[PDB]
């Protein structure tokens, strides 16, 4: 009944459905445009 609730339920379903493809596309864009290395998880001193 609530317009906000209905719109957000649709968007939530869509966002969760398209999760992995979007992540891979974003990773490809970052790889091709910014950098090909990841320093995030490097525990090295």
């Amino acid at each position: 009944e609530n317009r906000l609730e209905s719109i957000l339920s649709r968007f939530d379903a869509d966002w969760t459905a398209s999760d992995e493809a979007r992540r891979e596309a974003k990773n490809d864009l970052f790889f091709s445009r910014v950098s090909q290395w990841d320093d995030w998880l490097s525990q090295y001193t």
């Binding site: 719109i7 968007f11 966002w15 979007r22 995030w40």
Partner: protein, 48 residues
């Protein structure tokens, strides 16, 4: 303009230092297919 909006932001963790951009808003397009009334007029020049 005072009430700053907020939404699911798709550029999470831009990484090195300043995150800069904020203020996410969404526009939701929806399509409704239905039968609505049409009027059949008579064109004064020719045809209907």
């Amino acid at each position: 303009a005072d009430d700053i909006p907020s939404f699911q932001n798709p550029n999470d963790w831009v990484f090195p230092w300043l995150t800069q951009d904020t203020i996410q808003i969404a526009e939701f397009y929806e399509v409704v297919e239905k039968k609505e009334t049409a009027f059949i007029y008579q064109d004064p020049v020719t045809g209907e």
